[PDB]
Design an enzyme around this catalytic site. Structure first.
Site, PDB file in Angstrom:
ATOM      1  CE1 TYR A  41      78.214  -4.648  -5.492  1.00  0.00           C
ATOM      2  CE2 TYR A  41      79.339  -2.713  -4.609  1.00  0.00           C
ATOM      3  CZ  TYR A  41      78.302  -3.637  -4.555  1.00  0.00           C
ATOM      4  OH  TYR A  41      77.352  -3.549  -3.569  1.00  0.00           O
ATOM      5  CE1 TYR A  86      88.199  -9.245  -3.651  1.00  0.00           C
ATOM      6  CE2 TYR A  86      88.112  -8.735  -1.298  1.00  0.00           C
ATOM      7  CZ  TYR A  86      88.761  -8.662  -2.523  1.00  0.00           C
ATOM      8  OH  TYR A  86      89.971  -8.009  -2.616  1.00  0.00           O
TER       9      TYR A  86
END
Ligand code: NI
Ligand SMILES: [Zn+2]
Ligand SMILES: [Zn+2]
Ligand SMILES: [Zn+2]
Length: 269
Positions: free
Chosen positions: A165, A259
């Site tokens: 990311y 997450y």
């Protein structure tokens, strides 16, 4: 019901976006929309392949980096967990994060320690998986109820690396500054780098710069997860947010995550 001008405008917009994708260094990334007439996602962003640092962010100085020299011929040999100085950051069930297949072993935790530029092994060193980047060709597509998502174009075995990311590394300060600017934003591309000390309070923002992953959607039963990979074993104020498939991913299956930090990894509980 689109008039000639609009039809042509949408056409050119979708082609500009595909041009933007063809310029990405790596496996192919395609763009599809079988749901509506929306040309593509907004073009106001740039694809990058490295974190973009900003004002106020003090990056981990590479100068004070440890470099393993246990590089015989190939990489560092995954059978010598007691030879690497990249692994000295912990000794309990010792082992390299990856097997021979390059996949992420199931006995590997939320932290991966890869070899540095200060190590002596080549780029084919089995402990340089994340660094070698994406291998899976991907497709950005229009989901029916959610915005755009991303799905794999090939089958990906559990444990396979997908991508990192990327974005702008901003301080949790400016992060909030931007938080005061997020208007009717359906998606706020924010990712906190708090896997360790919370003093740095650094966050990754992919709003204007990012990788294909900025298109990944959240979900409850995700098939990919974040693995905090580090090279500067000494200063984890900034590290790589790496996505690895947690389960087998069928071709054309949408990629999703959620997450949870080291609060979903190491615990069967
Ligand atoms: Ni088309
Ligand atoms: Zn090594
Ligand atoms: Zn090393
Ligand atoms: Zn190495």
């Amino acid at each position: 019901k689109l008039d000639s001008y609009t039809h042509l405008s949408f056409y050119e917009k979708r082609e500009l976006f595909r041009k933007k994708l063809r310029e990405i260094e790596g496996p192919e990334v395609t763009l599809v929309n079988e749901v509506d007439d929306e040309p593509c996602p907004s073009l106001d962003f740039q694809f990058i392949s490295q974190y973009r640092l900003t004002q106020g962010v003090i990056p981990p100085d590479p100068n004070f980096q440890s470099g393993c020299n246990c590089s015989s011929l190939g990489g560092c040999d995954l059978n010598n967990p007691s030879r690497c100085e990249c692994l000295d950051d912990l000794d309990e069930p010792t082992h390299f994060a990856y097997d021979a297949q390059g996949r992420v072993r199931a006995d590997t935790g939320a932290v991966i320690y890869e070899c540095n530029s200060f190590c002596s092994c080549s780029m084919e060193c089995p402990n340089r998986v994340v660094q070698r980047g994406r291998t899976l060709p991907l497709e950005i597509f229009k989901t029916k109820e959610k915005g755009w998502g991303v799905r794999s174009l090939r089958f990906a075995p559990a444990g396979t690396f997908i991508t990192c990311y990327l974005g702008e590394v901003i301080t949790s300060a400016e992060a909030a500054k931007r938080d005061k600017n997020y208007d009717d934003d359906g998606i706020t591309y924010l990712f906190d780098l708090d896997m360790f000390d919370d003093a740095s309070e650094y966050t990754v923002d992919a709003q204007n710069y990012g990788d294909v992953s900025r298109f990944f959607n959240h979900s409850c039963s995700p098939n990919i997860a974040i693995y905090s990979a580090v090279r500067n074993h000494g200063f984890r104020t900034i590290y790589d947010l790496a996505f690895f498939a947690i389960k087998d991913i069928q071709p054309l299956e949408e990629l999703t995550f959620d997450y949870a930090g080291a609060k979903d990894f190491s615990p069967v509980q």
